[PDB]
Design an enzyme around this catalytic site. Structure first.
Site, short mmCIF file in Angstrom:
data_model
loop_
_atom_site.label_atom_id
_atom_site.label_comp_id
_atom_site.label_asym_id
_atom_site.label_seq_id
_atom_site.Cartn_x
_atom_site.Cartn_y
_atom_site.Cartn_z
N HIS B 41 0.85 -1.20 -0.15
CA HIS B 41 0.29 0.15 -0.46
C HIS B 41 0.98 1.52 -0.12
CE1 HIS B 41 0.19 0.05 4.78
NE2 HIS B 41 0.23 1.03 4.24
N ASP B 90 -1.23 -7.30 1.94
CA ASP B 90 0.14 -6.04 1.59
C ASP B 90 1.20 -6.40 1.89
OD1 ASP B 90 0.03 -3.03 3.77
OD2 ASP B 90 0.32 -2.99 1.91
N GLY B 190 2.54 6.17 9.64
CA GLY B 190 3.48 6.68 9.10
C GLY B 190 4.83 6.15 8.96
N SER B 192 4.29 2.60 8.14
CA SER B 192 3.96 1.20 6.95
C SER B 192 4.93 1.10 6.27
CB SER B 192 2.78 2.43 6.14
OG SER B 192 1.40 2.63 7.27
N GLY B 193 4.88 -0.66 6.45
CA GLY B 193 5.72 -0.83 5.96
C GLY B 193 7.00 -1.72 6.60
C1 LIG Z 1 -3.11 -2.45 3.37
C2 LIG Z 1 -3.20 -1.23 4.05
O1 LIG Z 1 -5.19 -0.61 4.49
C3 LIG Z 1 -4.67 1.40 5.61
C4 LIG Z 1 -5.86 0.21 6.26
C5 LIG Z 1 -6.66 2.11 7.05
O2 LIG Z 1 -7.57 2.10 7.78
C6 LIG Z 1 -8.99 0.98 6.88
C7 LIG Z 1 -9.84 1.30 7.68
C8 LIG Z 1 -4.74 2.66 7.38
F1 LIG Z 1 -5.05 4.32 8.39
C9 LIG Z 1 -3.87 2.75 7.41
C10 LIG Z 1 -2.89 3.19 6.68
N1 LIG Z 1 -2.19 2.89 7.88
C11 LIG Z 1 -1.92 1.81 9.39
C12 LIG Z 1 -0.65 1.46 9.74
C13 LIG Z 1 -0.87 0.66 11.43
C14 LIG Z 1 -1.95 1.24 12.30
C15 LIG Z 1 -1.48 0.53 13.24
N2 LIG Z 1 -3.57 0.64 13.75
N3 LIG Z 1 -0.86 0.10 14.00
C16 LIG Z 1 -2.97 1.99 11.20
O3 LIG Z 1 -4.23 2.56 12.86
C17 LIG Z 1 -2.55 2.53 9.94
C18 LIG Z 1 -2.33 3.95 6.09
O4 LIG Z 1 -1.19 3.98 5.57
N4 LIG Z 1 -2.92 4.76 5.82
S1 LIG Z 1 -2.87 5.74 4.23
O5 LIG Z 1 -4.31 6.75 3.95
O6 LIG Z 1 -1.48 6.06 4.74
C19 LIG Z 1 -3.12 4.10 2.49
C20 LIG Z 1 -2.54 4.62 1.40
C21 LIG Z 1 -2.26 4.04 1.13
C22 LIG Z 1 -3.24 2.82 0.81
C23 LIG Z 1 -4.18 3.28 2.11
N5 LIG Z 1 -5.07 1.91 2.34
C24 LIG Z 1 -3.86 4.08 2.93
C25 LIG Z 1 -4.08 1.34 5.86
#
Ligand SMILES: CCOc1cc(OCC)c(F)c([C@@H](Nc2ccc(C(=N)N)c(O)c2)C(=O)NS(=O)(=O)c2cccc(N)c2)c1
Ligand SMILES: [Ca+2]
Ligand SMILES: [Ca+2]
Lengths: 53, 254
Positions: B41, B90, B190, B192-193
């Site tokens: 993502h 992911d 932030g 993520s990954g």
């Molecule tokens: C496959 C990624 O899917 C999501 C979904 C999320 O909410 C769903 C209801 C989310 F907040 C995040 C979020 N990652 C994340 C990482 C960790 C946490 C945490 N609480 N540990 C957590 O609460 C959130 C994220 O990266 N959001 S984003 O807007 O930057 C983005 C960018 C590109 C693709 C996606 N899907 C999202 C990502």
């Protein structure tokens, strides 16, 4: 039995029969004569933290 | 990272910082000198792949101390099963343009064998998650690399202990929950990954990838991570292949 206590292996484990098993180590490590322990063969083996080592 | 602490410089040597046009994009995990594992993502909005940079040996974003090593990304490989905008599958495998030099501050995390990870690592309760993400939900990101110890939950227990949400995405076999439900500790957007690293008999292994959550450290909820053990074979096969022209590559999964 690799499924139980990792077959006694420090790292990787493979079952051969109901009574035989081989342990293995990741690249950068070598298996010791005890057949279970792994020792680094390079300066920066994966998963170890130099400043703490 | 919410509720953790600063990872002492050099103690999270496999941590990767991904940048797009110099701005923080996501975290990653170095698994050898030229391969990095991150989350698929993280690349949903890339327009020009040439702006993507991976930094190893990073600690404090405010100063350059000479331990940082930056590399262009030559390839971003994503499972064919991943659909942008959704949560399943992911994971992304990145090939650096040039290998990084291993030093006290740059060391790969071990990618475990699938059997070892499923039969043994999956039962180690606590693991470390790290990154320069938000220190609080809807808060500023960190200047120093942060790390947090989180306990893993079996999916049945995660669902039972979590509060039900309508649009809530499903927790599949390609994911796992880890964290706390009291709203005190969790990874965040932030991060993520980034790595979810597990210790076993003196060595650390990659077991998860910061993926998603219903808010960060939301009471009644847990952090959700990509279950890396499902992708060991997929990753190993790709690492044995020759690079292909064009940065983004969708590879068949399984
Ligand atoms: C496959 C990624 O899917 C999501 C979904 C999320 O909410 C769903 C209801 C989310 F907040 C995040 C979020 N990652 C994340 C990482 C960790 C946490 C945490 N609480 N540990 C957590 O609460 C959130 C994220 O990266 N959001 S984003 O807007 O930057 C983005 C960018 C590109 C693709 C996606 N899907 C999202 C990502
Ligand atoms: Ca720095
Ligand atoms: Ca080199």
């Amino acid at each position: 039995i690799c499924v139980n206590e990792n077959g006694g292996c420090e790292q990787y484990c493979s079952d051969h029969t109901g009574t035989k098993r081989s342990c293995r180590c990741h690249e950068g490590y070598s298996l010791l004569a005890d057949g279970v322990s792994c020792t680094p063969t390079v300066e920066y083996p994966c998963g170890k933290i130099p400043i703490l080592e | 990272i919410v509720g953790g602490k600063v990872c002492p410089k050099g103690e999270c040597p496999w941590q990767v910082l991904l940048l797009v046009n110099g701005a923080q994009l996501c975290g990653g995990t170095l698994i050898n000198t030229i391969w990095v594992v991150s989350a698929a993502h993280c690349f949903d909005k890339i327009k020009n792949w040439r702006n993507l940079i991976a930094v190893l040996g990073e600690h404090d974003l405010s100063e350059h101390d000479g331990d940082e090593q930056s590399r262009r990304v030559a390839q971003v490989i994503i499972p064919s099963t991943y659909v942008p905008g959704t949560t399943n599958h992911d994971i992304a495998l990145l090939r650096l343009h040039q290998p990084v030099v291993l030093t006290d501050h740059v060391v790969p995390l071990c990618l475990p064998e699938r059997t070892f990870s499923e039969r043994t690592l999956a039962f180690v309760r606590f693991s470390l998650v790290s990154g320069w993400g938000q220190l609080l939900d809807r808060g500023a990101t960190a200047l120093e690399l942060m790390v947090l110890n989180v306990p893993r939950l079996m999916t049945q227990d995660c669902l039972q202990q979590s509060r039900k949400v309508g649009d809530s995405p499903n927790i599949t076999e390609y994911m796992f929950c880890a964290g706390y439900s009291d709203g005190s500790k969790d990874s965040c957007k932030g991060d993520s990954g980034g790595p979810h690293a597990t210790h076993y008999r003196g060595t650390w292994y990659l077991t998860g990838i910061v993926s998603w959550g219903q808010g960060c450290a939301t009471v009644g909820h847990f952090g959700v991570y990509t279950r890396v053990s499902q992708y060991i074979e997929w990753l190993q096969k790709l690492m044995r292949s020759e690079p292909r022209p064009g940065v983004l590559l969708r590879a068949p999964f399984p």
